[PDB]
Amino acid sequence: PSLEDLLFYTIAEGQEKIPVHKFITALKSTGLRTSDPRLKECMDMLRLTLQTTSDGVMLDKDLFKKCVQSNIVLLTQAFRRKFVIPDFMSFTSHIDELYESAKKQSGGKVADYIPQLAKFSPDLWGVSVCTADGQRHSTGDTKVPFCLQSCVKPLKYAIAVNDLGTEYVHRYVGKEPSGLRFNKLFLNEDDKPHNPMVNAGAIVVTSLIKQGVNNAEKFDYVMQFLNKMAGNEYVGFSNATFQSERESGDRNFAIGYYLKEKKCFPEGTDMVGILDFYFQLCSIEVTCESASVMAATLANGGFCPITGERVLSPEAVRNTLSLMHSCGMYDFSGQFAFHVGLPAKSGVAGGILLVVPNVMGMMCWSPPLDKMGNSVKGIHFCHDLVSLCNFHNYDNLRHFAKKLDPRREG
Amino acid sequence: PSLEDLLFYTIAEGQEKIPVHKFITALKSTGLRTSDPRLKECMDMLRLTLQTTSDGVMLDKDLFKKCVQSNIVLLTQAFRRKFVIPDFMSFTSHIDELYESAKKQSGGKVADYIPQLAKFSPDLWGVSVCTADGQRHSTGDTKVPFCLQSCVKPLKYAIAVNDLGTEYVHRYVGKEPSGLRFNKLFLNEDDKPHNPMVNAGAIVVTSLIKQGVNNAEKFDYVMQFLNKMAGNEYVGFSNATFQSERESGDRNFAIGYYLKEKKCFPEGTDMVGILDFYFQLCSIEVTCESASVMAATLANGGFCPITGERVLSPEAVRNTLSLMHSCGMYDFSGQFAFHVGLPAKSGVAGGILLVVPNVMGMMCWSPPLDKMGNSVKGIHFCHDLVSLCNFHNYDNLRHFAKKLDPRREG
Numbered sequence: 001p002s003l004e005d006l007l008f009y010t011i012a013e014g015q016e017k018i019p020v021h022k023f024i025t026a027l028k029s030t031g032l033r034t035s036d037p038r039l040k041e042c043m044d045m046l047r048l049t050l051q052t053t054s055d056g057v058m059l060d061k062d063l064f065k066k067c068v069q070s071n072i073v074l075l076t077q078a079f080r081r082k083f084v085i086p087d088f089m090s091f092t093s094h095i096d097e098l099y100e101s102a103k104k105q106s107g108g109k110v111a112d113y114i115p116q117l118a119k120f121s122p123d124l125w126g127v128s129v130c131t132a133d134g135q136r137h138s139t140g141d142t143k144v145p146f147c148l149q150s151c152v153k154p155l156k157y158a159i160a161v162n163d164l165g166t167e168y169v170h171r172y173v174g175k176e177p178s179g180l181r182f183n184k185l186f187l188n189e190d191d192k193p194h195n196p197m198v199n200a201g202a203i204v205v206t207s208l209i210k211q212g213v214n215n216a217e218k219f220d221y222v223m224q225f226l227n228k229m230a231g232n233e234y235v236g237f238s239n240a241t242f243q244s245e246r247e248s249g250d251r252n253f254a255i256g257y258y259l260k261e262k263k264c265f266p267e268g269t270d271m272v273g274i275l276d277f278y279f280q281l282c283s284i285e286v287t288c289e290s291a292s293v294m295a296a297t298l299a300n301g302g303f304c305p306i307t308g309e310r311v312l313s314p315e316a317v318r319n320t321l322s323l324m325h326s327c328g329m330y331d332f333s334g335q336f337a338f339h340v341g342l343p344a345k346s347g348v349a350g351g352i353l354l355v356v357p358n359v360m361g362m363m364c365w366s367p368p369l370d371k372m373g374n375s376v377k378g379i380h381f382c383h384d385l386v387s388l389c390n391f392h393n394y395d396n397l398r399h400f401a402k403k404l405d406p407r408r409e410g
Numbered sequence: 411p412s413l414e415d416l417l418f419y420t421i422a423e424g425q426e427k428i429p430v431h432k433f434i435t436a437l438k439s440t441g442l443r444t445s446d447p448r449l450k451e452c453m454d455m456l457r458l459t460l461q462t463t464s465d466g467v468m469l470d471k472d473l474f475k476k477c478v479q480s481n482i483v484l485l486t487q488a489f490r491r492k493f494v495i496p497d498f499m500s501f502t503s504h505i506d507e508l509y510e511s512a513k514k515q516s517g518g519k520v521a522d523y524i525p526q527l528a529k530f531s532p533d534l535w536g537v538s539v540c541t542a543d544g545q546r547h548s549t550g551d552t553k554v555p556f557c558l559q560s561c562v563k564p565l566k567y568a569i570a571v572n573d574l575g576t577e578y579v580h581r582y583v584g585k586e587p588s589g590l591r592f593n594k595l596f597l598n599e600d601d602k603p604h605n606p607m608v609n610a611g612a613i614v615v616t617s618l619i620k621q622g623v624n625n626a627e628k629f630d631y632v633m634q635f636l637n638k639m640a641g642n643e644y645v646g647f648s649n650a651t652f653q654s655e656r657e658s659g660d661r662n663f664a665i666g667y668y669l670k671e672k673k674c675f676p677e678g679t680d681m682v683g684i685l686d687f688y689f690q691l692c693s694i695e696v697t698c699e700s701a702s703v704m705a706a707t708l709a710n711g712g713f714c715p716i717t718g719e720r721v722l723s724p725e726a727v728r729n730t731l732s733l734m735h736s737c738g739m740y741d742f743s744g745q746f747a748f749h750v751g752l753p754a755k756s757g758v759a760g761g762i763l764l765v766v767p768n769v770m771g772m773m774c775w776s777p778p779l780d781k782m783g784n785s786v787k788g789i790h791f792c793h794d795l796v797s798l799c800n801f802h803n804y805d806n807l808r809h810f811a812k813k814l815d816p817r818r819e820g
């Protein structure tokens with residue numbers, strides 16, 4: 001027998017030759033994009049075959065063989081419905097409906113304490129999905145770049161835990177939500193920031209990464225790390241946002257001096273320099289599409305789903321997901337954990353980085369924020385998604401009443 | 411041929427007739443107990459054929475069929491390794507090692523604020539497992555009755571959500587942990603108890619159940635409900651503990667009067683009567699074995715795994731598991747959520763009701779408590795369990811480093 005051949009007969013349909021466009025259409029309907037880095041050899045060989053034989057363009061078993069050989073495992077799982085969401089076309093139809101429903105939620109106020117966000121139209125709204133198998137779907141404004149802002153907090157904590165371990169990192173930062181009106185306290189009773197998802201905690205975490213090297217190399221080190229998490233999709237930087245943030249960051253400077261006085265930083269920390277680095281990390285730019293791949297890396301236990309590359313330790317990812325679950329949505333964190341039950345992180349630019357463990361990552365972006373600082377449409381979408389699908393952390397995978405389970409078929 | 415026959419040859423081993431003891435021994439190693447209520451018809455039929463003789467006695471394919479045919483689906487999944495933990499004998503060996511490691515953790519203090527807790531030996535230590543498929547294992551003192559105490563709090567919250575819905579229940583009680591020192595406050599800022607897992611929340615939740623009927627019928631209703639949750643294994647009542655709890659429940663009376671003055675109860679509540687009902691609920695008795703079945707009902711989306719009966723709505727179970735995750739272990743709740751990542755609830759008698767969603771429920775019981783009120787051995791066991799197995803809520807089911815996954819053949 002042969003894997004290329006019985007996959008050939010799978011698409012062949014009794015016919016002798018597969019039209020090339022018919023193979024591409026079947027591939028796309030699994031959810032994989034033709035640009036997937038794991039399919040490069042196959043797509044290069046297909047394009048090359050369309051050049052060397054315009055006497056075509058139809059693939060016989062042996063020419064189909066030589067195109068798919070290099071990527072045959074991934075291609076087989078895709079075509080034998082082995083991906084985490086088998087009927088991806090049906091699922092994206094649901095995502096689109098959820099998207100259109102949240103589109104009609106027009107309230108909230110765009111953040112405006114800096115010029116680079118008041119800039120953003122209230123009506124931008126994008127949602128991108130990347131499953132742990134690399135299946136992609138986007139709807140709305142998913143290639144508009146925006147700053148991560150606090151969405152970067154779980155990512156830089158994960159880097160810190162990856163490089164230094166749980167025990168070291170959490171000598172400096174706690175692991176719990178603060179409680180609905182210890183919002184305002186910079187430190188818990190052990191003189192540590194409450195958790196990595198608040199500014200004081202994120203500032204301390206920022207000071208743990210790549211200690212001893214200067215800010216230029218620290219930033220490059222973090223960027224290279226975000227590139228891998230995003231499978232090398234768009235990660236950028238907004239210098240306009242950085243300059244405005246550092247120029248308007250009086251409270252973060254208040255936090256910085258308070259943490260210095262309380263000796264919250266590692267020995268030899270230049271606190272003002274860490275604040276600069278912090279403002280830079282908040283100014284890193286993504287799109288919905290690229291950020292959804294970062295989320296999918298966290299959903300996939302530290303492996304980037306569109307490259308296969310191990311990016312973060314399971315410990316770093318587990319810790320990060322734990323704290324996103326309980327600390328990720330500002331004062332809405334307890335409500336979100338109860339009703340949505342998914343690890344998520346929101347930012348002032350309107351992003352919500354969302355993780356369904358073992359299923360998928362998402363980025364929802366809509367600049368208008370509610371009074372707790374969370375994107376109105378993102379919050380609405382997240383509630384709807386879990387109303388529809390049994391993705392709540394404490395939904396049961398066997399007894400889920402009327403919810404839909406996109407992991408199953410019939 | 412047919413399913414009874416095709417399973418007959420599996421156990422037959424080429425032999426022409428199966429000894430009865432060889433079938434029982436094979437069944438037990440799947441993890442099922444012969445007393446499983448779903449196997450009653452089969453065991454009754456075995457009982458009848460064991461009476462027609464005093465020989466072997468040995469089953470030919472046709473009489474085996476006559477015994478097993480009523481329970482053939484369940485018997486097939488058990489014998490063709492379809493249960494959630496396929497190699498259960500290997501898994502119980504690990505449970506045994508975890509048990510023996512926690513046994514040497516000899517610290518902590520037995521609760522003594524009333525005599526009924528104060529008499530329990532410091533050295534009692536039991537762990538019971540019930541998977542979502544009804545596979546059972548116990549090690550240590552697992553048939554000694556002890557009071558649920560605060561372990562009853564998630565069960566009566568589940569009942570209330572089951573009967574009345576999330577929205578009504580949470581008019582009276584919040585959905586969040588209070589934070590590591592708004593510990594002492596009875597109400598959050600919306601004049602509701604912070605969540606159902608604290609005394610103030612449980613007291614209010616108690617006032618929502620079976621309203622309008624008197625306390626005796628209320629207690630009967632809750633007992634019946636716990637019977638279904640435990641698949642009719644042991645549930646009792648300690649009047650001694652009840653009497654002691656009510657005479658030394660000064661703080662609970664302080665809470666009750668405070669909630670009354672703040673109008674936290676439904677109209678027509680007799681607050682002093684509700685406190686009495688509350689003390690009774692804390693005095694309900696279980697064993698490790700019966701309580702692990704209750705936990706397994708929560709692990710199984712509201713279906714009792716050893717009877718098949720729907721006991722709780724999926725919404726009640728999801729809500730209960732969410733609040734156990736974040737509020738279940740007193741001031742250790744945040745540490746426990748971060749490190750163990752399992753919904754759990756502890757009580758002052760030393761019980762820890764533990765749920766691994768979609769896998770199993772457990773009850774750990776060891777009377778000596780740490781400084782936060784949690785059983786020392788239970789806390790140690792829970793950490794060890796998640797160190798060993800990829801059961802952390804934010805462990806990945808595909809990439810889990812060196813952890814063991816008992817869900818996998820491979």
Ligand SMILES: O=C(Cc1ccccc1)Nc1nnc(NC2CCN(c3nnc(NC(=O)Cc4ccccc4)s3)CC2)s1
Pocket residue numbers: 184185186187188189190191591
């Ligand atoms: O001490 C501890 C450890 C601890 C914790 C818990 C229990 C015991 C011990 N942590 C600390 N972290 N940060 C501290 N100083 C900060 C200075 C800036 N902030 C603020 N300064 N001033 C305000 N004022 C209103 O916030 C005003 C207000 C009044 C009423 C209602 C709402 C708001 S916050 C927050 C306090 S101290």
Ligand SMILES: O=C(Cc1ccccc1)Nc1nnc(NC2CCN(c3nnc(NC(=O)Cc4ccccc4)s3)CC2)s1
Pocket residue numbers: 181594595596597598599600
């Ligand atoms: O008000 C709110 C809502 C709220 C929440 C957040 C922000 C604004 C509004 N909830 C309330 N719940 N219960 C209240 N009265 C209770 C009477 C019994 N308890 C206690 N009484 N007295 C103590 N005394 C020390 O606990 C001693 C101590 C003091 C400071 C530090 C450590 C220890 S507790 C708790 C207070 S009020």
